[PDB]
Design a protein around this ligand. Structure first.
Ligand SMILES: [Mg+2]
Ligand SMILES: [Mg+2]
Ligand SMILES: [Mg+2]
Ligand SMILES: [Mg+2]
Ligand SMILES: [Mg+2]
Ligand SMILES: [Mg+2]
Ligand SMILES: [Mg+2]
Ligand SMILES: [Mg+2]
Ligand SMILES: [Mg+2]
Ligand SMILES: [Mg+2]
Ligand SMILES: [Mg+2]
Ligand SMILES: [Mg+2]
Ligand SMILES: [Mg+2]
Ligand SMILES: [Mg+2]
Ligand SMILES: [Mg+2]
Ligand SMILES: [Mg+2]
Ligand SMILES: [Mg+2]
Lengths: 116, 70, 104, 118, 66
RNA sequence: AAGGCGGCCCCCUGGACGAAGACUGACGCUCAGGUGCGAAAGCGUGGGGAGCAAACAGGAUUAGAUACCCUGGUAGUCCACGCCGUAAACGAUGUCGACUUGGAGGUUGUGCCCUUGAGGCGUGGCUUCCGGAGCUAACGCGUUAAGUCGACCGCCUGGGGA
RNA sequence: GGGGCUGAUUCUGGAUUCGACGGGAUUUGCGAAACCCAAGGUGCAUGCCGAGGGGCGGUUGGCCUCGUAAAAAGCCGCAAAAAAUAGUCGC
């Protein structure tokens, strides 16, 4: 394939599931791994251990493109905002930027009704 | 909150700096506040109750510490 | 009259038409027996965000005393002139004389 | 001469050291102007050896406002190798509030008599 | 210790972009009066100046955005 | 004024408040009937329709669950014209006006004093908290009164039935 | 068109911002990595090896110790100026 050097990480931690996706700099998603696919279902995958083993599955997924640099764009609230990039430090690609790309509307579309 | 790494700064320190920066810039707090639609009467009423408790503690600590208790 | 204050950004490829914009808008203001007080070309400037997929822009400030009809003629010619991306017209109470805080 | 009016309403002082700064002669034409400040003269003492914080350099500004001496300058204080071990151990734990008590001279410099206000 | 009352400025201009960058923060928000110390009238004129600079793209709407 | 009003810019426009002056010279207050404005939901006509979402469908929990919770989802929300005239339309406190110990702040002017640094001495308007005598069934209100009074208006005479 | 006023310290004057934080230098007095020097104090010992340790990470290329296989020392951030966790009950 095309063994590129730099990658970007996308950590879409939400309130139930945590998805890690190594893309390139340009935008094509190279590899991905989910905390729901990494060996859990239902109650377990809203814990940051599930996020860190999702990042380990993703390290398996792109330990062959020659990724030697990796900036991380975390998104959303929930479990795996911090322990996911802890696991990416364990995986060992270099981290330059740790940016937060959480979509905050400036009072835009109406959120749903409050769960009793 | 784009946060670079600087040289001779280990990643535990860089992640702590990102943590405290995102926390004080208010991403978690604002997603938890904009998850569900807090109806405008509950907005005004929660604000009034927060103002009541804020003024009440900031007055009542003097109104309780003006004496001895031991 | 009033004290309108017009500050507008021009497409960076049309940056050499801009002295023609200076002359034409000065003449279209002064022909209505209306004064014109200060006038600055800030030059090209890098933007905080891409406005219409574009990252440098040519800033022009002017402070005009003119009637409202020729001010609104200037506003529709700003909206129908392609070279200008954004244009603000702010009604100030007092007419200025001094220098802008950015040029220094 | 000068005086601060931030904590002038507020409390008194327990300790007195003859700790003046060595404020430079880039500000003589603003020293002999009258516009007083010893404003926000909180000093913190550390491995930088008694950094004062944010000294407003007298905005008369006769030097065409580029560089008179500084907009705000940090500067150190004139005490002993033993007194700046005592005050070192006193200051370097809690983020204290200290302040100058006056602005006068002994014919050479602008003398500061420091003190903490609990 | 409001700097507008400490430098006596009558009407706050919107093109002193460094003195507005003092009062926007790391994300592009507006630091409140609990953190600066401005009197509320100059805080509101400051907020209007920040909105005019943000529409004129002198300042950014958010530090992230492109 | 009440409902209410929240990015920025322009056009039209009402009101308030402050300062020294000037002026008209009781022109004032309240107001039955009468009129005007009056959130949201609703209706009519015609547009729009991203989100949200009564009705509705499916999934569960349940003894059943025509509900909460989940996945969808049409009215409606929105724009212009109208109609309805109702709300715990609340400060559960009609308007106007006078007099009566104080403190804490906020807000918006303004006078003076050396703004001698981000001060200090007063006068206005508006506004939230604590509280005195007074009052009150008590709670509490307390110079913005539920205090002491005056003018005019509205309303109540046991709970249901209603 | 000249004279006086700012070369701040009434000049025949010696740091005096007592000692700042870093100096190029000298007598004094006390450490073995400040030292000539013992077997001067002291013996199964020595210099240089290698490797591992506070709820978590970092820090001494070193504090402590060990020899054919894995263990005990000194310090920081981990919110206390408004703050972090739970379906099933009808009479
Ligand atoms: Mg939901
Ligand atoms: Mg008369
Ligand atoms: Mg009537
Ligand atoms: Mg409606
Ligand atoms: Mg309709
Ligand atoms: Mg119907
Ligand atoms: Mg329709
Ligand atoms: Mg639709
Ligand atoms: Mg009714
Ligand atoms: Mg209401
Ligand atoms: Mg109410
Ligand atoms: Mg009523
Ligand atoms: Mg009575
Ligand atoms: Mg009371
Ligand atoms: Mg009464
Ligand atoms: Mg009563
Ligand atoms: Mg029964």
């Amino acid at each position: 394939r095309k063994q590129v050097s730099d990658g970007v990480a996308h950590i879409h931690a939400s309130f139930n599931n945590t998805i890690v996706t190594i893309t390139d700099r340009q935008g094509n998603a190279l590899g991905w791994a989910t905390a729901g696919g990494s060996g859990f279902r239902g109650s377990r995958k809203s814990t940051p251990f599930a996020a860190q083993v999702a990042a380990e599955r993703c390290a398996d997924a792109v330990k062959e493109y020659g990724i030697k640099n990796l900036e991380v764009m975390v998104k959303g609230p929930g479990p795996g905002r911090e322990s996911t990039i802890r696991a990416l430090n364990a995986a060992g690609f270099r981290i330059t930027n740790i940016t937060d790309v959480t979509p905050i509307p400036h009072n835009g579309c109406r959120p749903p009704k409050k769960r009793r | 909150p784009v946060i670079k790494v600087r040289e001779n700064e280990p990643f535990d320190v860089a992640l702590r700096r990102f943590k405290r920066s995102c926390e004080k810039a208010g991403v978690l707090a604002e997603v938890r506040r904009r998850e569900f639609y807090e109806k405008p009467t509950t907005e005004r009423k929660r604000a009034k109750a927060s103002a009541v408790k804020r003024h009440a503690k900031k007055l009542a600590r003097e109104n309780a510490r003006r004496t001895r208790l031991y | 009259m009033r004290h309108y204050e017009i500050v507008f950004m021009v497409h960076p490829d049309q940056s050499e038409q801009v002295p023609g914009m200076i002359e034409r808008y000065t003449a279209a203001i002064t022909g209505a027996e209306g004064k014109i007080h200060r006038l600055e070309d800030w030059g090209r400037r890098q933007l905080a965000y891409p406005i219409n997929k574009l990252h440098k822009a040519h800033y022009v400030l002017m402070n005009v005393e003119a009637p409202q009809e020729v001010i609104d003629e200037l506003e529709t010619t700003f909206r129908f002139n392609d070279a200008v991306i954004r244009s603000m017209v702010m009604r100030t109470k007092h007419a200025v004389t001094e220098a802008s805080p950015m040029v220094k | 001469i000068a005086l601060n009016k931030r904590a002038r309403h507020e409390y008194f002082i327990e300790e007195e050291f003859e700790a003046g700064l060595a404020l430079q002669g880039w500000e003589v034409k603003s020293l002999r102007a009258g516009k007083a400040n010893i404003s926000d003269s909180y000093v913190l003492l550390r491995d930088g050896e008694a950094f004062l914080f944010g000294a407003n350099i007298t905005p008369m500004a006769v030097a065409s406002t580029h560089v008179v001496c500084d907009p705000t300058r940090t500067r150190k204080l004139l005490l002993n190798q033993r007194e700046l071990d005592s005050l070192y151990g006193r200051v370097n734990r809690e983020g204290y509030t200290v302040v100058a008590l006056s602005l006068y001279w002994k014919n050479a410099w602008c003398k500061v008599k420091i003190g903490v206000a609990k | 210790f409001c700097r507008f009352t400490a430098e006596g400025v009558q009407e706050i201009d919107y093109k002193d972009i460094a003195t507005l960058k003092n009062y926007i923060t790391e994300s592009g928000k507006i630091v409140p009066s609990r953190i600066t110390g401005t009197r509320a009238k100059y805080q509101r004129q400051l907020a209007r100046a920040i909105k005019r600079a943000r529409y004129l793209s002198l300042l950014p709407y958010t530090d992230r955005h492109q």
